[PDB]
Amino acid sequence: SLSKQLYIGGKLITSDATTEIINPATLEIVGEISAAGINEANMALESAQEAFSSWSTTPAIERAQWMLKLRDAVIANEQHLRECVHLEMAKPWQSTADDFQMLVDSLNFYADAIVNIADEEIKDNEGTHSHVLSREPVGVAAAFLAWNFPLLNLAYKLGPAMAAGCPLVVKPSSKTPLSAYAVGELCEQIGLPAGVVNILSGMDSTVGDAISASTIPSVLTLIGSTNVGKHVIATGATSIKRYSMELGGNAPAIVCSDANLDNAADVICGVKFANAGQICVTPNRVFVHESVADEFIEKVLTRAKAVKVGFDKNEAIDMGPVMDANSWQRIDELVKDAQQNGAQLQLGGKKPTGVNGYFYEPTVLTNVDSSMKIYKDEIFGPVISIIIFSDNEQVLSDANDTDAGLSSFIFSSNEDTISYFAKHLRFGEVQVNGIKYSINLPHFGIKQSGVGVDCSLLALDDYLAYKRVSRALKV
Amino acid sequence: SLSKQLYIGGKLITSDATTEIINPATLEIVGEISAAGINEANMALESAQEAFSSWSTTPAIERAQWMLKLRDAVIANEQHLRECVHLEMAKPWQSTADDFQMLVDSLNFYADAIVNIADEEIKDNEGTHSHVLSREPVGVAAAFLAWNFPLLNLAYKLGPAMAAGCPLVVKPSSKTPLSAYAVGELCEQIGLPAGVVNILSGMDSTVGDAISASTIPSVLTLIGSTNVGKHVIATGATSIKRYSMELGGNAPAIVCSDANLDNAADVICGVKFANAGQICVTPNRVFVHESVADEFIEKVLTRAKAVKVGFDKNEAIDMGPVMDANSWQRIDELVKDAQQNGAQLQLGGKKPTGVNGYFYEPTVLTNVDSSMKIYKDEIFGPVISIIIFSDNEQVLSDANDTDAGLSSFIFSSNEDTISYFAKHLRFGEVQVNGIKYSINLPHFGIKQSGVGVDCSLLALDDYLAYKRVSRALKV
Ligand SMILES: NC(=O)c1ccc[n+]([C@@H]2O[C@H](COP(=O)([O-])OP(=O)(O)OC[C@H]3O[C@@H](n4cnc5c(N)ncnc54)[C@H](OP(=O)(O)O)[C@@H]3O)[C@@H](O)[C@H]2O)c1
Ligand SMILES: NC(=O)c1ccc[n+]([C@@H]2O[C@H](COP(=O)([O-])OP(=O)(O)OC[C@H]3O[C@@H](n4cnc5c(N)ncnc54)[C@H](OP(=O)(O)O)[C@@H]3O)[C@@H](O)[C@H]2O)c1
């Protein structure tokens, strides 16, 4: 049941080609999917377009019931969905719960949110007209998803698009498409109307470019890198479209003099090694003060040494391997470039001895400065990069010394210090003394980290168009 | 006082080039401006960027005081501002009040709006963290403005950008730059901080493309045509930017059998001949039922024949000329092409004899059908294009048979017909039995009419970025 077909137009159809999924830990074939071509891409766009007139006029409560029906099928098929993520990217068995649960959480949140949307009246200052502001479905939506959270990233778009009445064309990453294809099988099982949801994977220069260049979609959304976001914006300029982009980050983490070093180490290591550091909001530059530098490093090394690395559903594995060889080499060249410029390797910086798979050990780097490539670029790996600072006003300028604008962290027990950083940090998210994300809390970045919001009620703004109906009262 | 210079970096500077302004009625040189080049365009972008650190950190109340101080200078120079609009495009003196008053209304609305912005807390469903959602200035904003309302189009962007703390680079139309250059003189007069507002006019291939392709602006906004919107989106893809575009329209106006014909003729003729029909929300296709066809045309003709056409500050002129020869020729070709395919010319259709200037007479055309070019394309002139329908469901499909999604009009006395069209009309605005626009009422389009809103509190959304501050409660 791991040889899955395309879900286009409410039907499970096969392809002209085929792509196999290879597990990055065992490097064996774990499944195959029917790969889409330009013809299959146009088939999904046309079926999504034809379904707009009926799906957008379907009452919100009826759409919400279709979402809850898919949610019931997702809960019933929990083991298969988590196993799909487990096999396609060697994600630890317990961390696959985050992917699966977010899909249930998203379907629940936006089924309930859409039935609470109400029109609003605008006051006429002249007393000559009445005005009613309503919200309606925009059109077809197309989504390109990163591979780091296959089902979570899918949930961020599937939930809102279904609730807002927008037929959706999903393109999962060719590296992790099995779990999304399984969701399409669930929509075919419950009998979801044709064209509402379409799931296909294919080559970027053909399938992906064709979906963006098409004049059918009204909204293009991407969870990925900044460079691909620029390409999608330019490629989609064949028509006027909405863009919702959640792109790369370079999160600073500031551990101050008065910070709880045990809490800062627990939080930082927890998210630096979960998903092998392949997380958009994880710290990329760990700023540590002089007076607590040596004490904070000893705490991070102890936690890093206690990270269970491997690939086994039966075992309590904490961290798996990175996605593929390109990721492994990119991370390794950043660690090795830092050492040649004076950085000190305290732990890791290599693959375990004689191990099969693209595993990278929990790495701890010190003596990092602003001129190194590991400082300017997004690591997206299990590398804790530590920079020593002394002054708060200087570490703030260094923290803002990046084109990214996603997440950021400040660890301190001083209210004047917390207020100072929370205000002047140029990032969409400021985490204070911890980390927290949820389906109801908005996730977003500013500057080059994208435009648009995932989670919370604001995620519906990309899929709903306003309409003002103004009526003359005199005649 | 009709030779004005660039307003860049808080100073009025000259250039090596000059653009002469010709009145489209008298065809005489009425003024001259210092034309900007690529070097001057980079001077404005650099000064706007350097101003962001200080202008964005200026308190909202203090920024609103600068807006009200500019408003006072605007009110003091009301005659000169309306004079520049009157001379650059031959706009009737009575109609120059709309441009002027909207600039005062916009500065008033958004100065009061920015001081009432408040943070919002978000509930944590787990009780482990606190969350505060705030809004902050995004960055530098650049605006390209259409010529049809020089000061009103400037008002829509200047008001929000100043209030939201975003240094603004404005490029007015090369055809109508005098009025905006005078606003920059008022800015230099009151001592507005340097880089907050920059006003330069230049060539599209050089000045306009260098502004979009620059990686400095965070927001690119355009009041113009759809094809230019697509060009700005692609050209701005050198970095991740926000796009706020209010583009072309093709408004249908449905006069049903039960409509007040006197009210429909008053509303349609008023906005069809105001500004010589060079209004984006004006009806482009007038649908009239068979039973009221002969009676509605007679009412429209008597109102069209009563339009005073000319160019005189001391006379109550209702309508002036179109913008230039290209506009005149484009409109004339649509009328002549329509007559070749069966349209009946009832009035106008030509320039008045002997008169100087690009005047086009109030024009009434009947027997228009869906195949004609004047039906598929935006007229943007003083031409009332009349199509006759019989079935309400058919005219609704014809009304929606367009790529545009701006304004739309329904004239009826039946509540079931009004509700039917108000729901199924796929347009941003549905005007019932009249027309209403104001600084507090949102103005926007859907589909290819662009993305983003002008006027209302929603206009601040393009210039304000969110920020979530989450704090662990246990620590
Ligand atoms: N802001 C957030 O919430 C968030 C969340 C997760 C990740 N991220 C960011 O994502 C990045 C890592 O993800 P990644 O390296 O997989 O991103 P990526 O290389 O930019 O790819 C992202 C997705 O876009 C697809 N794609 C690539 N080129 C395309 C084209 N020309 N047309 C259409 N689609 C195309 C890819 O499919 P293929 O895989 O088939 O090429 C992939 O599924 C990091 O920078 C991280 O910061 C951000
Ligand atoms: N939705 C609305 O609220 C609204 C309001 C007003 C008008 N409109 C639309 O605007 C259209 C008529 O205006 P128009 O004929 O002036 O439209 P246009 O030809 O697209 O010009 C719009 C503005 O953009 C500038 N521009 C042109 N090319 C550019 C480039 N490459 N880079 C930067 N800027 C550039 C033009 O400057 P130059 O004049 O110097 O070339 C002009 O000021 C109509 O279709 C109407 O529907 C819409």
Side-chain angles (χ1 to χ4, degrees), chain A residues 445-473 475:
Chain A
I446 67 177
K447 288 148 60 194
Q448 295 308 300
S449 296
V451 279
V453 180
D454 275 337
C455 297
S456 88
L457 307 177
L458 300 172
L460 287 173
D461 288 357
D462 287 317
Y463 304 90
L464 295 169
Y466 283 109
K467 166 187 278 180
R468 169 161 65 94
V469 178
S470 294
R471 178 162 178 170
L473 301 172
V475 170

Short mmCIF file of all heavy atoms in Angstrom, two decimals, chain A residues 445-475, unseen atoms left out:
data_model
loop_
_atom_site.label_atom_id
_atom_site.label_comp_id
_atom_site.label_asym_id
_atom_site.label_seq_id
_atom_site.Cartn_x
_atom_site.Cartn_y
_atom_site.Cartn_z
N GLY A 445 6.97 35.50 9.16
CA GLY A 445 8.22 36.21 9.18
C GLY A 445 8.11 37.52 8.42
O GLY A 445 7.21 37.71 7.60
N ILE A 446 9.03 38.43 8.72
CA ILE A 446 9.08 39.72 8.04
C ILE A 446 10.34 39.78 7.19
O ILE A 446 11.12 38.82 7.14
CB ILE A 446 9.04 40.89 9.04
CG1 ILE A 446 10.31 40.93 9.88
CG2 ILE A 446 7.80 40.79 9.93
CD1 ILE A 446 10.36 42.10 10.85
N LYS A 447 10.54 40.90 6.50
CA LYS A 447 11.73 41.16 5.67
C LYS A 447 11.81 40.06 4.62
O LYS A 447 10.79 39.77 3.96
CB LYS A 447 12.95 41.31 6.56
CG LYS A 447 12.97 42.62 7.35
CD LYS A 447 13.66 42.45 8.69
CE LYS A 447 15.10 42.02 8.52
NZ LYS A 447 15.68 41.52 9.80
N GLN A 448 12.96 39.42 4.42
CA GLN A 448 13.11 38.43 3.36
C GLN A 448 12.64 37.04 3.76
O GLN A 448 12.71 36.12 2.94
CB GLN A 448 14.57 38.37 2.90
CG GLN A 448 15.05 39.65 2.24
CD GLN A 448 14.14 40.09 1.12
OE1 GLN A 448 13.94 39.37 0.14
NE2 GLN A 448 13.56 41.28 1.26
N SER A 449 12.15 36.87 4.99
CA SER A 449 11.64 35.58 5.44
C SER A 449 10.22 35.30 4.97
O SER A 449 9.68 34.24 5.30
CB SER A 449 11.72 35.47 6.96
OG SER A 449 13.06 35.51 7.41
N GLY A 450 9.61 36.21 4.22
CA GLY A 450 8.36 35.93 3.55
C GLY A 450 7.30 36.97 3.83
O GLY A 450 7.53 37.98 4.49
N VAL A 451 6.11 36.70 3.29
CA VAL A 451 4.94 37.55 3.44
C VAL A 451 3.72 36.64 3.54
O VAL A 451 3.46 35.86 2.62
CB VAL A 451 4.78 38.55 2.28
CG1 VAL A 451 5.68 39.75 2.49
CG2 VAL A 451 5.10 37.87 0.95
N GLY A 452 2.99 36.72 4.65
CA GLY A 452 1.87 35.83 4.85
C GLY A 452 1.96 35.09 6.17
O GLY A 452 3.05 35.00 6.76
N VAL A 453 0.84 34.56 6.64
CA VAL A 453 0.75 33.98 7.98
C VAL A 453 0.21 32.56 7.88
O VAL A 453 -0.79 32.32 7.20
CB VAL A 453 -0.14 34.83 8.90
CG1 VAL A 453 -0.22 34.22 10.29
CG2 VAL A 453 0.37 36.26 8.97
N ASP A 454 0.87 31.63 8.56
CA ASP A 454 0.35 30.30 8.78
C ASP A 454 -0.14 30.18 10.22
O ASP A 454 0.38 30.85 11.12
CB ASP A 454 1.41 29.23 8.49
CG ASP A 454 1.47 28.86 7.02
OD1 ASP A 454 0.46 29.06 6.31
OD2 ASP A 454 2.53 28.36 6.58
N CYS A 455 -1.16 29.34 10.42
CA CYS A 455 -1.85 29.17 11.70
C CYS A 455 -2.65 30.42 12.08
O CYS A 455 -2.60 31.44 11.39
CB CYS A 455 -0.87 28.81 12.82
SG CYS A 455 -0.01 27.24 12.60
N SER A 456 -3.42 30.32 13.18
CA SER A 456 -4.30 31.38 13.66
C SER A 456 -5.39 31.72 12.65
O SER A 456 -5.43 31.16 11.54
CB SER A 456 -3.50 32.64 14.00
OG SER A 456 -3.35 33.48 12.86
N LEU A 457 -6.30 32.63 13.02
CA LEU A 457 -7.35 33.04 12.10
C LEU A 457 -6.80 33.83 10.92
O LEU A 457 -7.44 33.86 9.86
CB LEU A 457 -8.39 33.88 12.84
CG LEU A 457 -9.01 33.27 14.10
CD1 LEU A 457 -9.97 34.25 14.76
CD2 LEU A 457 -9.71 31.97 13.77
N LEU A 458 -5.64 34.47 11.08
CA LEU A 458 -5.09 35.30 10.01
C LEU A 458 -4.73 34.49 8.77
O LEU A 458 -4.66 35.07 7.67
CB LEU A 458 -3.87 36.06 10.52
CG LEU A 458 -4.13 36.99 11.71
CD1 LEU A 458 -2.83 37.54 12.27
CD2 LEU A 458 -5.06 38.13 11.31
N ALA A 459 -4.50 33.18 8.90
CA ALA A 459 -4.18 32.36 7.75
C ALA A 459 -5.32 32.30 6.74
O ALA A 459 -5.08 31.97 5.57
CB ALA A 459 -3.82 30.94 8.20
N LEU A 460 -6.55 32.61 7.16
CA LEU A 460 -7.68 32.66 6.24
C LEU A 460 -7.70 33.91 5.38
O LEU A 460 -8.46 33.95 4.40
CB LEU A 460 -8.99 32.57 7.03
CG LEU A 460 -9.34 31.21 7.63
CD1 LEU A 460 -10.57 31.33 8.52
CD2 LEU A 460 -9.57 30.18 6.53
N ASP A 461 -6.90 34.92 5.71
CA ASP A 461 -6.93 36.17 4.95
C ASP A 461 -6.42 35.98 3.53
O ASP A 461 -6.83 36.72 2.62
CB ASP A 461 -6.12 37.24 5.67
CG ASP A 461 -6.81 37.76 6.92
OD1 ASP A 461 -7.95 37.32 7.20
OD2 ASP A 461 -6.22 38.60 7.63
N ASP A 462 -5.54 35.00 3.30
CA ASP A 462 -5.03 34.75 1.96
C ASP A 462 -6.04 34.04 1.07
O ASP A 462 -5.91 34.10 -0.16
CB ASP A 462 -3.74 33.93 2.03
CG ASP A 462 -2.56 34.73 2.54
OD1 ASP A 462 -2.40 35.89 2.11
OD2 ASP A 462 -1.80 34.20 3.38
N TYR A 463 -7.04 33.38 1.65
CA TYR A 463 -8.00 32.59 0.89
C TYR A 463 -9.37 33.24 0.79
O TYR A 463 -10.24 32.70 0.09
CB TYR A 463 -8.13 31.19 1.50
CG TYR A 463 -6.82 30.45 1.61
CD1 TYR A 463 -6.02 30.57 2.74
CD2 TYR A 463 -6.37 29.64 0.57
CE1 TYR A 463 -4.82 29.90 2.84
CE2 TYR A 463 -5.17 28.96 0.67
CZ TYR A 463 -4.40 29.10 1.80
OH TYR A 463 -3.20 28.43 1.90
N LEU A 464 -9.59 34.37 1.45
CA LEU A 464 -10.88 35.04 1.45
C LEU A 464 -10.73 36.44 0.87
O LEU A 464 -9.82 37.18 1.24
CB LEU A 464 -11.45 35.12 2.87
CG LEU A 464 -11.81 33.77 3.50
CD1 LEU A 464 -12.10 33.94 4.98
CD2 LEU A 464 -13.00 33.15 2.78
N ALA A 465 -11.62 36.78 -0.05
CA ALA A 465 -11.66 38.10 -0.67
C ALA A 465 -12.81 38.91 -0.08
O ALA A 465 -13.89 38.37 0.16
CB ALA A 465 -11.81 38.00 -2.18
N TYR A 466 -12.57 40.20 0.14
CA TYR A 466 -13.60 41.07 0.67
C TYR A 466 -14.60 41.44 -0.42
O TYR A 466 -14.33 41.35 -1.62
CB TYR A 466 -12.99 42.35 1.24
CG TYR A 466 -12.34 42.18 2.60
CD1 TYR A 466 -10.96 42.23 2.74
CD2 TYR A 466 -13.11 41.99 3.74
CE1 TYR A 466 -10.36 42.09 3.98
CE2 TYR A 466 -12.51 41.85 4.99
CZ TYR A 466 -11.14 41.90 5.10
OH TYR A 466 -10.55 41.76 6.33
N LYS A 467 -15.79 41.85 0.02
CA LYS A 467 -16.80 42.41 -0.87
C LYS A 467 -17.61 43.43 -0.10
O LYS A 467 -18.14 43.12 0.98
CB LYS A 467 -17.73 41.33 -1.44
CG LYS A 467 -18.98 41.90 -2.10
CD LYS A 467 -19.96 40.82 -2.52
CE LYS A 467 -19.58 40.20 -3.85
NZ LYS A 467 -20.55 39.14 -4.26
N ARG A 468 -17.70 44.64 -0.63
CA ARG A 468 -18.52 45.69 -0.05
C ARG A 468 -19.78 45.87 -0.89
O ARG A 468 -19.70 46.08 -2.10
CB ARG A 468 -17.77 47.02 0.05
CG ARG A 468 -18.67 48.21 0.40
CD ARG A 468 -17.87 49.39 0.94
NE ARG A 468 -16.96 49.96 -0.05
CZ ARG A 468 -17.27 50.99 -0.83
NH1 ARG A 468 -18.47 51.55 -0.75
NH2 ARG A 468 -16.38 51.45 -1.70
N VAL A 469 -20.93 45.77 -0.24
CA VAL A 469 -22.22 46.01 -0.87
C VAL A 469 -22.77 47.30 -0.28
O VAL A 469 -23.12 47.35 0.91
CB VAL A 469 -23.20 44.85 -0.67
CG1 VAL A 469 -24.55 45.17 -1.30
CG2 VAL A 469 -22.62 43.57 -1.25
N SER A 470 -22.82 48.35 -1.09
CA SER A 470 -23.30 49.66 -0.67
C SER A 470 -24.63 49.96 -1.35
O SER A 470 -24.73 49.90 -2.58
CB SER A 470 -22.27 50.74 -0.99
OG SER A 470 -21.09 50.56 -0.23
N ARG A 471 -25.63 50.30 -0.55
CA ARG A 471 -26.98 50.54 -1.04
C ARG A 471 -27.41 51.96 -0.71
O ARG A 471 -27.26 52.41 0.43
CB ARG A 471 -27.97 49.54 -0.44
CG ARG A 471 -29.41 49.75 -0.89
CD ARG A 471 -30.27 48.52 -0.65
NE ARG A 471 -31.66 48.75 -1.02
CZ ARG A 471 -32.58 47.79 -1.08
NH1 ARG A 471 -32.26 46.53 -0.80
NH2 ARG A 471 -33.82 48.10 -1.43
N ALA A 472 -27.94 52.67 -1.70
CA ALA A 472 -28.48 54.00 -1.47
C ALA A 472 -29.75 53.90 -0.63
O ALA A 472 -30.62 53.07 -0.90
CB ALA A 472 -28.77 54.69 -2.80
N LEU A 473 -29.85 54.76 0.38
CA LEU A 473 -31.01 54.73 1.27
C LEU A 473 -32.12 55.67 0.83
O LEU A 473 -33.30 55.38 1.06
CB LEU A 473 -30.58 55.07 2.70
CG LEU A 473 -29.53 54.12 3.30
CD1 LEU A 473 -29.03 54.63 4.64
CD2 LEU A 473 -30.09 52.71 3.43
N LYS A 474 -31.77 56.79 0.18
CA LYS A 474 -32.78 57.76 -0.22
C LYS A 474 -33.70 57.20 -1.30
O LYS A 474 -34.93 57.27 -1.18
CB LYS A 474 -32.11 59.05 -0.70
N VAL A 475 -33.12 56.63 -2.35
CA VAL A 475 -33.91 56.06 -3.43
C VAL A 475 -33.52 54.60 -3.66
O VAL A 475 -34.29 53.69 -3.37
CB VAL A 475 -33.76 56.87 -4.73
CG1 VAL A 475 -34.39 56.13 -5.90
CG2 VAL A 475 -34.38 58.25 -4.58
#
